[PDB]
Amino acid sequence: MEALVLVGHGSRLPYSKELLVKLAEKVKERNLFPIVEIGLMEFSEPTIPQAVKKAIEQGAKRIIVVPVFLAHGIHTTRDIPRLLGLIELEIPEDVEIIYREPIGADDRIVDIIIDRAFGR
Amino acid sequence: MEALVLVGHGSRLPYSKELLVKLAEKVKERNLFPIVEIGLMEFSEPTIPQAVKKAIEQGAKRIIVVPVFLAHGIHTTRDIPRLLGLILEIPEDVEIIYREPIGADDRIVDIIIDRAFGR
Ligand SMILES: O=C(O)CCC1=C(CC(=O)O)c2cc3[nH]c(cc4nc(cc5[nH]c(cc1n2)c(CC(=O)O)c5CCC(=O)O)C(CCC(=O)O)=C4CC(=O)O)c(CC(=O)O)c3CCC(=O)O
C-alpha cells in the first residue's frame, strides 16, 4: 500500500551502506511499514531507482522517501530529486513519491552528540 | 580545561554550516562544556584547524572532537584525522580526543520515523 525507502549517500567504503542496512532492519523491527527498502545514491547497490522499483513491485502506491542525510545539500536538493524524477526511472501514474526532509538539528542529535563526546 | 569541537562536512550550499551552528548553540544551552566550537572540513569557515586553535587559545588542553557525520568514511577515517594531526596544524602538550560518529543509533530511527510522517 505504502512503502518506506531510506536513502543514503553511499561511499566507496562499506560503512555508509552498513548504516542504512542497520537502520532499515531496526525500522522493520518496529512494525510500522508494509514495505521497507534502502537505496544508495552513489558507489553502491541498491541504487535509489532500484529501491523505488522493488518497492513498487511489492505493491506500494505511495512511496515515502526519507533522505538519511544530516543537512540539505546538492544531493538532497538536486541529485536525489532527479533520480526520483521529481525534477525534469518511470513512476507509474497510480504511484506517488513523497520526498521527506533530512535529519536536521534535531534535539536528539544534540543528545547523541553529547553521548559521543563522552565516548558512549 | 576541556573543549568540545563539533566538526562537520561543509558544503557549497549553506545548510551544512547552519546545521553545525544550530547544534553548537543547543549544546551551549545545556551548560555541559566550558568551550564549544565548530569547524567545517571543506568549503566553509571556521575550518577544523581554526576551531581547534580557538579552543586551545581559550584555555582548553583537552579537546573533544566529535565528527557530526552519520557514518565513517574517507573524511572521518583519513581527511579529518590528518587535519587533527592524528596521522597546517601544530598542537601543544594538549590532547585531542577524536570521538565516534553518530552511527545507527536508535534515536536516528526515531528521527527517521518522524520524518517519514512529515514531523
Ligand atoms: O570521498 C571520496 O573520495 C568518494 C565518496 C564521495 C564523493 C565522490 C568523490 O569525491 O569522488 C563525494 C563527493 C563529494 N561530496 C560532497 C559533499 C557532500 N558530501 C556529503 C557527505 C558525504 N560525502 C561522502 C563521500 C563522497 N562525497 C560521503 C561518504 C564517504 O565518506 O565516503 C558522505 C557521507 C558522510 C556522512 O555520512 O555524514 C555531504 C553531507 C550530507 C549530510 O550533511 O549528511 C555533502 C554536502 C553537500 O551535499 O553539499 C562533495 C562536496 C560538494 O561538492 O559540495 C563532494 C565533492 C568533494 C568530496 O569528496 O568531499
DSSP letter string over B9-52?
---SSSHHHHHHHHHHHHHHHTT--SEEEEEESSSSSSBHHHHH
Q: Nearest Cβ partner of B22 from A23, A105, A111?
A: A105
Please tell me the total number of residues recorded for chain B in this structure. Answer: 119
Name the amino acid, one letter, at B51.
A
CA dihedral of residues A35, A41, A47, A50 (deg, nearest 10): 60
Instruction: Take residue B31 and report the three cell numbers written for it.
Output: 551548560
Q: Which residues of A are annotated as a binding site?
A: 9, 45, 70-75
CA distance A39 to A49: 7
> In sequence order, which ranges of A1-120 are alpha helices (DSSP H)?
15-29, 48-57, 74, 80-83, 107-117
CA distance B88 to chain A (A): 25
Cis before A46 (ω within 30): yes
Cβ contact, residue pair A105, B15, below 8 Å:
no
Asked whether the beta carbons of A96 and A60 are under 8 A apart, the reply is no
* Ligand 1 cavity residues, CB under 6 Å: A 9, 11-13, 16, 69-71, 73-75; B 9, 11-13, 16, 69-71, 73-75
Strand, coil or helix: what is A77?
A: helix
- Facing residue for A73 by CB, picked from B11, B32, B113: B11
Contact A31, A51 (CB under 8 A): no
- Which residue minimizes the CA distance to atom 52 of ligand 1? B11
Beta strands B62-67; B35-40: pairing state: unpaired
Cross-strand bridge partners of residue B96: B63
Before B46, cis peptide (omega within 30)?
yes
Contact of A96 with chain B, judged by CB distance below 8 Å, is answered with no
The answer to whether A30 and B113 are in contact (CB under 8 A) is yes
Neighbours of A25 (CB within 10 A): 13
Query: Is A42 buried (19+), middle (13-18) or exposed (0-12) by CB count in 10 A?
Result: middle
Cβ partners under 8 Å of residue B22, min gap 6:
A105
> CB distance A109–B68 less than 8 Å?
yes
Single-letter residue type at A106: D
Q: Side-chain half-sphere of B5: how many Cα atoms within 13 Å?
A: 30
Q: What's the rounded Cα separation, in Å, for the pair B2 and B55? A: 9
**Cβ contacts of residue A118 below 8 Å, gap of 6+?**
none
Q: How far apart are CA A87 and CA A67, in angstroms?
A: 16
Residue labelled with grid coordinates 560503512: A15
Question: Rounded to whole angstroms, how far apart are CA atoms A9 and A50?
Answer: 15
Segments in A30-106 forming alpha helices (H)? 48-57, 74, 80-83
- Determine the Cα–Cα distance for residues A97 and A74; give it in Å rounded to an integer: 19
Name the closest-CA residue to atom 47, ligand 1. Answer: A73
C-alpha to C-alpha distances, B64 to A5, A98, A101, B39, nearest whole angstrom: 35, 39, 30, 12
Neighbours of B16 (CB within 10 A): 24
| CA A93 to chain CA centroid, nearest Å | 22
**End-to-end CA gap in chain B:** 39
Elucidation technique: X-ray
